[PDB]
Amino acid sequence: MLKYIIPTIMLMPLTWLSKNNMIWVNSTAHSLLISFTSLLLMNQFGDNSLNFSLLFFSDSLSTPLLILTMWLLPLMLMASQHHLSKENLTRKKLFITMLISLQLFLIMTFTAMELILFYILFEATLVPTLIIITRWGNQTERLNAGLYFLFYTLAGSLPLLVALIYIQNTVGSLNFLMLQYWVQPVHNSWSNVFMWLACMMAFMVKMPLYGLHLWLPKAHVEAPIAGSMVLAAVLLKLGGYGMLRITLILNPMTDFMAYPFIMLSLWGMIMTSSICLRQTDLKSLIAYSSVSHMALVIVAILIQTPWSYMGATALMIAHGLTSSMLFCLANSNYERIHSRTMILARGLQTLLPLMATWWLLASLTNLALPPTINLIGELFVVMSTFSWSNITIILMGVNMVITALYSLYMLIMTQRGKYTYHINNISPSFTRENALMSLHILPLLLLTLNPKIILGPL
């Protein structure tokens, strides 16, 4: 509620209004504080969900999901600091403003009270993200990532507004989710498929199916300095949750056609992870993880029958961190050596000993050792999706193999002798290198102690 948007918009002139170089520490100081407010009135119910205003129930829903969104902001200025210190302050004042200008809508969205505040705010980004990709790129291939990032996201999300304005005047008012207490079903026709297909395909083009992901590595391979907005674009994607607000209801009873979204993404899950093994560019190698065990949720959501939402929620915020943090490693190791080519960096682990245990705990949580959230987020997937049909144990059982050769080959490539020609790579990871790389593995594993705070209603 205004408890949140108002201070975080109050942030906005906490920055430029300041002096010279004090700016970074000025806003990083406050931006942490809001996290007390983040929890503050939140983590109330529980049962019979919280709605505190007419057009906002901040998050009740058991999709808390908002606490993270308020984390990643003052993880950027620790992240983004590296080469952004080399241009002017009135531009550096900008890049902190639009970056907030993103953070303000992700608080608006995830609440939205309804469908039609979601959408205009579901499309309300792409103004702030697109401007961070095109400027402050690195290569010159960036200019095409500008377009491809649109012309999909916007391409098929217009058929929403044709459909959601079609519901508003058909049955009552969509003004509120919390009233669905009248919903008739959707039986069949050659019209209703389209309705269901229009109310869906806009979401898929964000969390990729194995088709129409053609943009995802185009934008991430070449993308701002620190992953500065690349950490944010790994929040944006998973935020396609809203399919959890719809497909639970609002055409419940068409599962009839589900199968082309099952067998299409269920054989890609065994697939695009395997086209990730021979990659020669590291920020590509991680970008294809992000498809894979993200695209497993799309077979979690379509199937009804909780024990999937038990396991589908834990995943949106499962790689929400692990897949975040890897883009933070591959950034750092790139500061020192200016190729992103994976081969070139070898013979590390002697020269940066403390950063050894940083790779490991990262690459260990794609392996998903049993105790952490990762498996307890996957093993509620397999338990329901097994009951669907027994044969799902094979493919998604293969996923649990190729992903293990997948991860290690990234670490074990950095255990070798190489002294080779590098006179660079002196800096022994000054604190920010290891400070911002923490505040992930500390908060991540921690939740396993009381992991009832990440769960759906079911």
């Binding site: 970074w24 520490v25 942490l32």
Partner: peptide, 24 residues
């Protein structure tokens, strides 16, 4: 970025301030 200063974020002072403002 080592003229044998120790350093974390940027320069002489508030760098020292900038570490206690993150850690704490």
């Amino acid at each position: 970025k080592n003229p044998d200063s120790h350093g974390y974020d940027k320069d002489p002072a508030v760098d020292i301030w900038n570490m206690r403002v993150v850690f704490f």
